[PDB]
Amino acid sequence: EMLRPLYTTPLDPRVLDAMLPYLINYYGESEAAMERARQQVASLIGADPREIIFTSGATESNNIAIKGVARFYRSRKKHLITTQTEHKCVLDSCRSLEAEGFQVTYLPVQKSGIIDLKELEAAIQPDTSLVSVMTVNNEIGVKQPIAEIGRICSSRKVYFHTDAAQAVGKIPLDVNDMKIDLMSISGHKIYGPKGVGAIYIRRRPRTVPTPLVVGLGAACEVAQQEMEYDHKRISKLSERLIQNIMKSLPDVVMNGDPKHHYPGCINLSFAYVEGESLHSSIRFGIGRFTTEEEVDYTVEKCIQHVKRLREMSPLW
Amino acid sequence: EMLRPLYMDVQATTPLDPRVLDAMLPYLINYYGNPHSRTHAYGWESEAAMERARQQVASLIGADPREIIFTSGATESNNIAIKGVARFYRSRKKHLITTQTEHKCVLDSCRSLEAEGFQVTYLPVQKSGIIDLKELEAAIQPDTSLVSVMTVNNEIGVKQPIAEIGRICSSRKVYFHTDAAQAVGKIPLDVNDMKIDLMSISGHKIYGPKGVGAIYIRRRPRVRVEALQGTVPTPLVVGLGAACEVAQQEMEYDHKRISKLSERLIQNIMKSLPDVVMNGDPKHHYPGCINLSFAYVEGESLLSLEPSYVLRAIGTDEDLAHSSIRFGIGRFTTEEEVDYTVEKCIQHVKRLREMSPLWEMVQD
Amino acid sequence: EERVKKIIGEQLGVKQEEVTNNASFVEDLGADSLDTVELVMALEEEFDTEIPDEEAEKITTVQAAIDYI
Amino acid sequence: TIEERVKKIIGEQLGVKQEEVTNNASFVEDLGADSLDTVELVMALEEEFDTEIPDEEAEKITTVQAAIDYINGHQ
Amino acid sequence: SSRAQVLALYRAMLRESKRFSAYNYRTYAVRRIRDAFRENKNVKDPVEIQTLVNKAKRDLGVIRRQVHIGQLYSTD
Amino acid sequence: ASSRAQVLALYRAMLRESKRFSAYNYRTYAVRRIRDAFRENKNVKDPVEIQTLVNKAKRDLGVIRRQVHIGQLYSTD
Numbered sequence: 019e020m021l022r023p024l025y026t027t028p029l030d031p032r033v034l035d036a037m038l039p040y041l042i043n044y045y046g047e048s049e050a051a052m053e054r055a056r057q058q059v060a061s062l063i064g065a066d067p068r069e070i071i072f073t074s075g076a077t078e079s080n081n082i083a084i085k086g087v088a089r090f091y092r093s094r095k096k097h098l099i100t101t102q103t104e105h106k107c108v109l110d111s112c113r114s115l116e117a118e119g120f121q122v123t124y125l126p127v128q129k130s131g132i133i134d135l136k137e138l139e140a141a142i143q144p145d146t147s148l149v150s151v152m153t154v155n156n157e158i159g160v161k162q163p164i165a166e167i168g169r170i171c172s173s174r175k176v177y178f179h180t181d182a183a184q185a186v187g188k189i190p191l192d193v194n195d196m197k198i199d200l201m202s203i204s205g206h207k208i209y210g211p212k213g214v215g216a217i218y219i220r221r222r223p224r225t226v227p228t229p230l231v232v233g234l235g236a237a238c239e240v241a242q243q244e245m246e247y248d249h250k251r252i253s254k255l256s257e258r259l260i261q262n263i264m265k266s267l268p269d270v271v272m273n274g275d276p277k278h279h280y281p282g283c284i285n286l287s288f289a290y291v292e293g294e295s296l297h298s299s300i301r302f303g304i305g306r307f308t309t310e311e312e313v314d315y316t317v318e319k320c321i322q323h324v325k326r327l328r329e330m331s332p333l334w
Numbered sequence: 335e336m337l338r339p340l341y342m343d344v345q346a347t348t349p350l351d352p353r354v355l356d357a358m359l360p361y362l363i364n365y366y367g368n369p370h371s372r373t374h375a376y377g378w379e380s381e382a383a384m385e386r387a388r389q390q391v392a393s394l395i396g397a398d399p400r401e402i403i404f405t406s407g408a409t410e411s412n413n414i415a416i417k418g419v420a421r422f423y424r425s426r427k428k429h430l431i432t433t434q435t436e437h438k439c440v441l442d443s444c445r446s447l448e449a450e451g452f453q454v455t456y457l458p459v460q461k462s463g464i465i466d467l468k469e470l471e472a473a474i475q476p477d478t479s480l481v482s483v484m485t486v487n488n489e490i491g492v493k494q495p496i497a498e499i500g501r502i503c504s505s506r507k508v509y510f511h512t513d514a515a516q517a518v519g520k521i522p523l524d525v526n527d528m529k530i531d532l533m534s535i536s537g538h539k540i541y542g543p544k545g546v547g548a549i550y551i552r553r554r555p556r557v558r559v560e561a562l563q564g565t566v567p568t569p570l571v572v573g574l575g576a577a578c579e580v581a582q583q584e585m586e587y588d589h590k591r592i593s594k595l596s597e598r599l600i601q602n603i604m605k606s607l608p609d610v611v612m613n614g615d616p617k618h619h620y621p622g623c624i625n626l627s628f629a630y631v632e633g634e635s636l637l638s639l640e641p642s643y644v645l646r647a648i649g650t651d652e653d654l655a656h657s658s659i660r661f662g663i664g665r666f667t668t669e670e671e672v673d674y675t676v677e678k679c680i681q682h683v684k685r686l687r688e689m690s691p692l693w694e695m696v697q698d
Numbered sequence: 699e700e701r702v703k704k705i706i707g708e709q710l711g712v713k714q715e716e717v718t719n720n721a722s723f724v725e726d727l728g729a730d731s732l733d734t735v736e737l738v739m740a741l742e743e744e745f746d747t748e749i750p751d752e753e754a755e756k757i758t759t760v761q762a763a764i765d766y767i
Numbered sequence: 768t769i770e771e772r773v774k775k776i777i778g779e780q781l782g783v784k785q786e787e788v789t790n791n792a793s794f795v796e797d798l799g800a801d802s803l804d805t806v807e808l809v810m811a812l813e814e815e816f817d818t819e820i821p822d823e824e825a826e827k828i829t830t831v832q833a834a835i836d837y838i839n840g841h842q
Numbered sequence: 843s844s845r846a847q848v849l850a851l852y853r854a855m856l857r858e859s860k861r862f863s864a865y866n867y868r869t870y871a872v873r874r875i876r877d878a879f880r881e882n883k884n885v886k887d888p889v890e891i892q893t894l895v896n897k898a899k900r901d902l903g904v905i906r907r908q909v910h911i912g913q914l915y916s917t918d
Numbered sequence: 919a920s921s922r923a924q925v926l927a928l929y930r931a932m933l934r935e936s937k938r939f940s941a942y943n944y945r946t947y948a949v950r951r952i953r954d955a956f957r958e959n960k961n962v963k964d965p966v967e968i969q970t971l972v973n974k975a976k977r978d979l980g981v982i983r984r985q986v987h988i989g990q991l992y993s994t995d
């Protein structure tokens with residue numbers, strides 16, 4: 019049993035144990051099971067169970083939300099706002115809407131990975147229908163001001179969607195305090211099974227297989243019970259990796275604005291070298307099951323490869 | 335994916351059949367969950383499960399379901415049979431007969447009975463691995479209680495005349511036990527056509543789960559045993575029954591295939607490596623277990639310890655029977671495993687015949 | 699085209715010399731429904747492309763398999 | 768005859784060198800351990816060699832002599 | 843009693859069997875299905891054909907459960 | 919409806935069962951999470967919270983048993 023450097027998520031045994039009886043009965047459905055899963059997903063994000071719809075993943079959730087609001091307002095609201103660093107599915111859906119006659123603005127991100135709230139608040143048009151901003155940047159590991167964006171959108175009577183696929187279970191989310199109207203959730207991001215996702219659709223005035231739905235609900239419940247422990251643990255391991263790299267390489271810098279970092283995603287940039295097979299940057303990931311041995315092995319291999327590639331380029 | 339030759343593990347020859355595990359899943363789920371999450375039907379579901387398993391095991395060996403008792407394996411079944419019949423009949427039946435090529439557990443139990451005061455005779459085997467029926471028929475005493483001869487030899491892979499032994503034992507009012515652990519589900523067994531009174535069955539030998547076995551105890555006429563100086567978990571019993579049913583439906587196909595692959599392995603090894611001999615009578619050999627001895631390989635073939643006591647009983651020399659290989663072929667064995675095994679065997683035998691073991695032998 | 703005819707020759711047991719571009723499967727190649735299903739599945743295994751049952755039913759000659767996308 | 772191996776395992780799990788290996792020493796009072804480290808200690812003794820210790824006998828192992836006289840008393 | 847559905851069952855059983863995470867189970871599955879349909883070729887009793895189709899459907903369910911659950915335990 | 923020795927027996931059972939995980943990440947995570955859990959919940963006086971933690975510990979013990987044994991039946995080397 020060897021190790022693997024830190025660059026989906028593993029299936030939490032509590033989740034697989036929760037979905038086993040439903041897997042057995044699925045080859046050869048339950049309203050109660052799907053209702054419990056609905057209550058679990060809702061309870062994680064601070065929503066009501068009636069506001070949760072199960073999809074095949076965060077991709078279908080994004081298309082349902084963005085394409086649903088956009089296609090519903092194809093009469094007098096053909097403008098949408100999103101980020102240029104969104105996931106590939108969100109960008110693809112916005113390009114499809116652009117092909118159907120919608121004007122879409124892709125807001126740039128600053129060198130910190132956070133969106134400019136002044137640029138967003140100044141980009142709203144009278145015919146703007148939906149604002150879709152990801153909850154966290156999965157590449158730099160920075161948090162977007164979701165609560166402030168929600169306040170700006172609710173103050174201007176414009177619907178707010180967010181792709182929380184890389185944020186659910188990793189940072190606290192309250193769908194009311196952040197004034198969120200639509201949210202996308204992916205199962206295999208929170209140690210749940212692949213092929214299942216969810217979407218939050220606000221209902222208050224401010225055919226996915228059953229084992230997969232059960233698995234998503236179980237993953238959300240375990241995440242709710244483990245968010246604090248996982249946050250402390252992953253924070254410690256992240257500081258260990260970053261500090262151990264800084265101790266041996268006095269010229270590496272960490273991309274992204276500090277004080278707005280979620281611990282799971284680290285992004286370190288190296289000076290005179292790039293492309294490390296096991297300027298550009300390298301994104302390390304640390305999760306619930308990451309061990310100290312994986313962190314130390316990753317720091318050792320990373321130091322070795324950086325030192326070698328710097329000793330193979332003629333410079334001074 | 336990297337292959338493994340057909341001589342590394344004896345358990346590797348009988349992996350857990352996915353149909354068996356599929357039969358065992360619900361009982362595993364309702365088992366390993368502490369008895370506060372179980373439903374108010376676990377007792378019935380477990381009595382019904384164990385009755386179905388009894389019907390499956392019994393139906394494979396041609397017995398009545400009431401005659402099947404579940405144990406932790408063929409070892410406990412052996413102790414129950416020999417020690418049960420011997421200790422229960424300590425009145426007028428103090429003699430037991432067995433073979434010198436039996437499994438280690440049976441021989442150990444017979445040595446225990448010998449230490450507690452029972453007279454046991456270990457019948458020798460001929461150079462073919464088969465016992466002499468005249469020696470068995472001439473060794474029965476008026477106080478002989480049990481004759482225990484395994485159905486298949488786990489080392490050489492030879493079949494004993496189980497039906498004839500049963501006829502001889504029933505002709506002189508002697509109980510007949512057999513260790514069918516390597517035979518159940520692989521060759522046909524009928525506890526009625528064969529005068530069998532007690533039978534041992536192993537779960538993991540018949541592509542079932544580990545830690546479960548069975549014993550057949552005849553009831554018409556009734557055979558009795560004494561308890562030994564506990565309850566096997568239900569998912570394992572379910573697994574044994576499922577393995578027996580699958581074996582009953584797959585025995586002919588598996589025997590045809592295993593015969594083909596066995597003949598391929600032996601022919602390919604003998605074709606490239608001369609001076610090779612096959613232990614056991616080919617005319618009474620089960621193809622799944624092959625045992626080959628190689629000539630000019632001095633010392634030992636490492637892959638200090640004792641040699642083989644089964645090969646010593648078939649009259650094989652110390653050096654010839656010391657370096658021997660037992661190949662195993664099963665339900666899931668592929669042709670690539672056979673060809674890779676014959677290639678690795680050719681390479682290792684060719685290498686070891688030109689060397690001498692004195693170098694590794696002197697490492698102190 | 700080399701992969702299609704090569705796979706057909708490999709599964710059906712034909713060398714690279716009897717690889718005729720115009721031979722019927724059931725009448726000129728000695729095959730059955732099972733060999734046909736396994737053949738289509740082998741074609742779906744060589745290149746990462748899937749073929750539905752309706753389009754597979756129309757594949758009764760060699761030229762149908764030779765470049766269909 | 769096998770007390771040295773027990774003391775070696777206790778020395779390995781509790782983080783004590785081969786100089787403070789005193790016979791007849793309490794785990795919580797003379798070795799700076801607690802109930803959790805004690806449970807892991809009994810599990811280490813039953814984990815090195817393939818022998819099992821029940822909960823009743825494991826609860827009685829609060830000193831070193833208890834562990835030395837329980838692995839020999841159940842052979 | 844179904845002509846096209848038997849071929850669809852053969853295709854489905856082969857496709858699902860190819861997804862076995864283990865080599866011995868995958869090879870055994872493809873071989874046993876191939877040899878099984880080939881052996882039961884040219885059967886005329888419709889009762890026997892229906893029985894074989896039922897066994898094939900149950901075995902297809904077994905292959906599905908074991909492939910999916912085994913894949914959920916198959917760490918790569 | 920629990921005592922001190924029963925809690926220690928529960929700790930021993932969860933550690934023993936967690937050590938039987940066929941995978942490295944699950945085994946290490948289980949042992950680490952159980953150690954940190956009992957150490958963190960050490961010196962709790964409210965009996966309601968203690969009973970809740972013990973019940974959750976028993977449920978998690980059932981999960982560990984099922985997953986360890988079933989995974990062991992699927993763990994091909």
Ligand SMILES: *P(=O)(O)OCC(C)(C)[C@@H](O)C(=O)NCCC(=O)NCCSC(=O)CCCCCCCCCCC
Nearest residue numbers: 731848874875878879882883884885891894895898901
């Ligand atoms: P083609 O010429 O159009 O079709 C071929 C023929 C005509 C022969 C065939 O399609 C047909 O119609 N024949 C009728 C008789 C027949 O074969 N009926 C189908 C019986 S199906 C069957 O035999 C089930 C076998 C399933 C065994 C599965 C074993 C593997 C289990 C693996 C477990 C891990």
Ligand SMILES: *P(=O)(O)OCC(C)(C)[C@@H](O)C(=O)NCCC(=O)NCCSC(=O)CCCCCCCCCCC
Nearest residue numbers: 802925948951952955959960961962968971972975978
């Ligand atoms: P020791 O100090 O001599 O005695 C033990 C003590 C006194 C510390 C303890 O028994 C005690 O009485 N302390 C008081 C507080 C208390 O009793 N707490 C109960 C502990 S129960 C608990 O918190 C366990 C939590 C559940 C762990 C779940 C782990 C899940 C892992 C899943 C892996 C997939």
